[PDB]
Amino acid sequence: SRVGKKLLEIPSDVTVTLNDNNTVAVKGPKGELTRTFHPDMEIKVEDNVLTVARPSDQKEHRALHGTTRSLLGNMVEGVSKGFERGLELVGVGYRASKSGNKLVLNVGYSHPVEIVPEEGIEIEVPSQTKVVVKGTDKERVGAIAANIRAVRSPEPYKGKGIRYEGEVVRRKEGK
Amino acid sequence: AIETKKVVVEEIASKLKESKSTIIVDYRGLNVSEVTELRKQLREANVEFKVYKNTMTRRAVEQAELNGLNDFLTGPNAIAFSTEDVVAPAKVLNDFAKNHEALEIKAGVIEGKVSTVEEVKAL
Amino acid sequence: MLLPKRVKYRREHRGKMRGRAKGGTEVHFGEFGIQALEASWITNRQIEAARIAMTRYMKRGGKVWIKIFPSKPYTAKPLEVRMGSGKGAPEGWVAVVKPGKVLFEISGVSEEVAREALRLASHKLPIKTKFVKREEIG
Amino acid sequence: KVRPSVKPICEKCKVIRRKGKVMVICENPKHKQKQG
RNA sequence: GAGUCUUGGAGGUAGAGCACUGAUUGGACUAGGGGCCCCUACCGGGUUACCGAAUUCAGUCAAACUCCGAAUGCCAAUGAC
RNA sequence: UAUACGUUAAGUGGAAAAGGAUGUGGAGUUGCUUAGACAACCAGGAUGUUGGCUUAGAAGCAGCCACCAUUUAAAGAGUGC
RNA sequence: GGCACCUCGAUGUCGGCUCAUCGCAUCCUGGGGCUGUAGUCGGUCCCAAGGGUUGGGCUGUUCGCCCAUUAAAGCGGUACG
Ligand SMILES: [Mg+2]
Ligand SMILES: [Mg+2]
Ligand SMILES: [Mg+2]
Ligand SMILES: [Mg+2]
Ligand SMILES: [Mg+2]
Ligand SMILES: [Mg+2]
Ligand SMILES: [Mg+2]
Ligand SMILES: [Mg+2]
Ligand SMILES: [Mg+2]
Ligand SMILES: [Mg+2]
Ligand SMILES: [Mg+2]
Ligand SMILES: [Mg+2]
Ligand SMILES: [Zn+2]
Numbered sequence: 001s002r003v004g005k006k007l008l009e010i011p012s013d014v015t016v017t018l019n020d021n022n023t024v025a026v027k028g029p030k031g032e033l034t035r036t037f038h039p040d041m042e043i044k045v046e047d048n049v050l051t052v053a054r055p056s057d058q059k060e061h062r063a064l065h066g067t068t069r070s071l072l073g074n075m076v077e078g079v080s081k082g083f084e085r086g087l088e089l090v091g092v093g094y095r096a097s098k099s100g101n102k103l104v105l106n107v108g109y110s111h112p113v114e115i116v117p118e119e120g121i122e123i124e125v126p127s128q129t130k131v132v133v134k135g136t137d138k139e140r141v142g143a144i145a146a147n148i149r150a151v152r153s154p155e156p157y158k159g160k161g162i163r164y165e166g167e168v169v170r171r172k173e174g175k
Numbered sequence: 176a177i178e179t180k181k182v183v184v185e186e187i188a189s190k191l192k193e194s195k196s197t198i199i200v201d202y203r204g205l206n207v208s209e210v211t212e213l214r215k216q217l218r219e220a221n222v223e224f225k226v227y228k229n230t231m232t233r234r235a236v237e238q239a240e241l242n243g244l245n246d247f248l249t250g251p252n253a254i255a256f257s258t259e260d261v262v263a264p265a266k267v268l269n270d271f272a273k274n275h276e277a278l279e280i281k282a283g284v285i286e287g288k289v290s291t292v293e294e295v296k297a298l
Numbered sequence: 299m300l301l302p303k304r305v306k307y308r309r310e311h312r313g314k315m316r317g318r319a320k321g322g323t324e325v326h327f328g329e330f331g332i333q334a335l336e337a338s339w340i341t342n343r344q345i346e347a348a349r350i351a352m353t354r355y356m357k358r359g360g361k362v363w364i365k366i367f368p369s370k371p372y373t374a375k376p377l378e379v380r381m382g383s384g385k386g387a388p389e390g391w392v393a394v395v396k397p398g399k400v401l402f403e404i405s406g407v408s409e410e411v412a413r414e415a416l417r418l419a420s421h422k423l424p425i426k427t428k429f430v431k432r433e434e435i436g
Numbered sequence: 437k438v439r440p441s442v443k444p445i446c447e448k449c450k451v452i453r454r455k456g457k458v459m460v461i462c463e464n465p466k467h468k469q470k471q472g
Numbered sequence: 473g474a475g476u477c478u479u480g481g482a483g484g485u486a487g488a489g490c491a492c493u494g495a496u497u498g499g500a501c502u503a504g505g506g507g508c509c510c511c512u513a514c515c516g517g518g519u520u521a522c523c524g525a526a527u528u529c530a531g532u533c534a535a536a537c538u539c540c541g542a543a544u545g546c547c548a549a550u551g552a553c
Numbered sequence: 554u555a556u557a558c559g560u561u562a563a564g565u566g567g568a569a570a571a572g573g574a575u576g577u578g579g580a581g582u583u584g585c586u587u588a589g590a591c592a593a594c595c596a597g598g599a600u601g602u603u604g605g606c607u608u609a610g611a612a613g614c615a616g617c618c619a620c621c622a623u624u625u626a627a628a629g630a631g632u633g634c
Numbered sequence: 635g636g637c638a639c640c641u642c643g644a645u646g647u648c649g650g651c652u653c654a655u656c657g658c659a660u661c662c663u664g665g666g667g668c669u670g671u672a673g674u675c676g677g678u679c680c681c682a683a684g685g686g687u688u689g690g691g692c693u694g695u696u697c698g699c700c701c702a703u704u705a706a707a708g709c710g711g712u713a714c715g
Contacts, residue, residue: 001592059577157672174672179588202596210600210624217624228626233588253595255626302495311535320488322532327498367496369533378635394533426571437668438679441573447633451574456563458574465668470680471573 004066008050008073011080016045024072028079031120031136035071038064043072074138083138085145086165087131094152094161098125107152107161115148132165183237190238193258195297196288197271199226200281201253208279215270220261227256243289253284268297300342300368301391308388309373319399325432327363328405330412332420332427339392340401342368344423352402352419360406366393395425437469 010016014028022043025034037043041064042053050072054065077083089096096105103115103123117123121135121144131148135141145164152161157174209226216224232250239246246254259267275282286295315337325331345364353362368391375386395401402419404412413429420427442460444451449462458471 172669172671176586176588183588200596204597204626206597206599206624206627209597209626213624214600222625226624226626230626231588237588304495306494306534307536313535317487320533327531363498365497365532367532369495381636421572424571439573443573453574453576456576460574468668 002066004052004054004062004069006069008069008076009048010045010050010076014076014080016076018043018045026075026079030079030082033075033079033136035075037068037071041065041068043068078136078138082134082136083141084132084134085141087133087145087148088163088165089129089131090154090159090161090163091129092160095128096125096131097128103131103148105148105151105162109152113151115151117144179234183234186234186238190258193260195264195290196256196258197264197267197297198249198253198285198288199255199257200275200283200285201228201255203281203283205279212270212274212280219266219270223258223260224267225256225258230254230256245289245294249286265298299346302369305371308371309385310371312372313370313394315394315396317396319396322365323398323400325400325403325430327365328360328403329432330405330409330416331363331400331403331430332416333430334395334399334401334425335397335428336425337394337396338425340366340368340395340423340425341393342391345393348402348419348422351422352404352415355415355418356404356407356411360404360412363403363405364401365403366395366399366401368393370394400430401427438472439469440471442469442471 011028014026017025017027019025021036021039022041023034023036024043024045025032040055041061042055044051044053050069052065052069052072054061091107094105094107096103098104101116101122103117103125104112105115106112115123117133118140121133121140123144124132124134126132133141133144133148135144149162149164154161154163154169156170157172159169163169213222213226216222232247232254235246235250274280275285287297288294290297319334323333345366345368349362349364370392371388372390372392373386374389401423402416404415407415416429442451442458444460444462445467446462446464449460449467451458451460453459460467460469462468
């Protein structure tokens with residue numbers, strides 16, 4: 001089938017707003033979200049109904065026609081409840097802690113590594129061996145978790161370093 | 176769509192005899208559980224305890240338009256044919272309970288089928 | 299190594315290779331075979347190099363049928379020499395191939411096995427080939 | 437593993453394109469390869 | 473004298489084919505025996521998986537192979553422009 | 554900086570091949586399919602049964618029976634890891 | 635090595651010295667992927683031309699062997715500068 005053809009509801013507090021040049025925004029119980037779209041593409045919304053009218057078929061139109069819909073879906077979902085992603089931390093003593101608003105991780109390096117997030121996203125730590133990022137949008141938490149993981153990639157010979165909240169790494173043997 | 180005509184015209188004689196039937200869950204069926212239960216049916220009677228699982232709703236709509244106008248609402252539902260073509264079904268109800276309570280096979284969406292005009296609470 | 303036992307002469311013009319294949323352009327001693335889409339000079343070692351692989355991949359179920367045969371001899375003067383003062387010494391034998399001639403043939407195996415074997419043999423020859431099966435009407 | 441002829445090895449190697457190049461990516465990184 | 477159009481000749485190239493000279497692929501028949509064994513001791517026979525003269529079935533090649541064979545070029549003729 | 558219809562996205566145009574590939578434009582052949590197709594998700598994937606077999610179970614890939622039919626809604630008594 | 639287009643009213647050839655400059659198919663330093671990489675050392679491939687890249691013994695020597703160091707003691711073009 002196709003994903004650019006499904007439908008999208010709109011909760012009560014979630015209020016979308018159409019504007020010239022197709023630059024829809026959203027007002028919800030967790031913050032705002034604006035994202036300009038392609039000028040050619042047509043966006044049309046009804047109460048509890050989302051529609052993406054596509055012009056004559058082409059190679060790039062069948063792509064944009066799904067991209068915009070997926071983005072609107074992610075947007076309404078984030079403004080409804082928001083996304084998050086945890087970060088397990090195995091170590092043999094590798095431990096993360098909190099300091100004001102920023103993050104500090106004492107990996108095997110010889111000096112503490114500092115990680116500070118941008119505005120609109122917070123970094124919570126529920127325990128000294130786990131990190132959990134929380135934010136409204138999806139690409140933001142994605143990028144923040146990637147930049148936090150890229151401090152210490154997981155070694156394959158033994159689980160050592162940062163890894164995602166649920167993932168399997170391969171294992172060799174060393175003697 | 177050739178052999179499907181054959182099977183939909185064959186199952187007429189199959190469904191034009193029984194009185195009581197019951198439905199089986201679709202998923203969570205262990206082939207080990209399946210062979211044990213089918214050998215249990217084997218040690219009681221013949222294979223008349225159906226395990227027919229090629230059973231998309233249209234054979235129901237083209238088979239049971241005469242009698243039993245209920246399976247249509249169980250179309251989008253876990254379906255597995257199982258009928259009674261032998262003496263009065265109570266022992267099959269006992270096997271159904273002791274197979275479907277909590278072990279290795281779930282009841283789930285099972286509500287039974289029709290005797291003459293009825294939906295649930297078979298005896 | 300294929301070569302003729304006796305020959306009339308031992309040196310010969312190189313000829314020309316314009317046109318199409320006079321004959322031999324239909325698989326009849328077997329079921330499958332590879333056709334030739336270009337014209338070149340298949341040597342005496344390339345043929346057996348392809349044949350060993352083609353017969354080794356298969357399980358000797360079906361037998362192969364080489365159709366070409368090195369006949370024309372060609373020469374080569376020794377190295378580090380000026381030009382002129384006679385013609386060179388015979389070196390080896392070659393075989394002329396023209397667009398459309400069926401080179402190899404397989405029969406007595408399945409279809410996928412035959413296709414893969416012919417493909418494995420096609421990489422040892424200096425021409426661009428295609429896979430053709432026996433005519434169905436005969 | 438750069439080479440002018442890329443093709444899957446096991447059954448689970450995919451073939452994609454990036455920036456106008458031909459890449460074969462897989463789960464076992466011994467199979468990852470790129471044309472040109 | 474020259475060009476062109478009708479008419480007639482000599483001549484074996486391109487191309488094709490196996491009618492001869494050679495080179496060759498796979499079957500039937502594979503003769504007469506070949507080695508082994510029954511023992512050819514002094515027979516014949518199972519394989520000689522035959523090395524192979526025959527023939528036949530089909531299938532390929534050839535500047536110093538032709539049962540064949542052009543388009544051009546060449547030599548003339550009586551008429552016309 | 555004419556008219557008309559197409560093709561290319563590389564600055565190909567404005568220097569090369571064997572080989573490789575869900576680039577794109579066509580013309581076909583062709584199996585399945587609103588008794589419902591492919592994907593994705595919810596299911597299981599062994600029973601005279603690992604059977605006659607082997608260094609240790611070899612109980613799936615010591616490695617050999619066409620290691621078989623059955624329960625059947627379905628299994629090579631293994632597709633691979 | 636082949637050819638014989640230019641130069642016979644004249645261009646004289648190898649090593650070393652002084653001075654260099656360019657290419658990248660990278661010797662070192664810089665950044666990465668796979669590993670039959672546990673660590674220290676390695677292997678092979680990718681990006682990269684900014685700088686650096688030795689003192690002697692034997693031989694006319696290019697070449698070559700040896701001694702002692704060095705992060706490394708690169709390969710080539712410039713009329714074999
Ligand atoms: Mg012929
Ligand atoms: Mg000729
Ligand atoms: Mg001739
Ligand atoms: Mg160009
Ligand atoms: Mg001269
Ligand atoms: Mg001359
Ligand atoms: Mg001059
Ligand atoms: Mg002068
Ligand atoms: Mg480079
Ligand atoms: Mg001295
Ligand atoms: Mg010089
Ligand atoms: Mg020079
Ligand atoms: Zn792979």
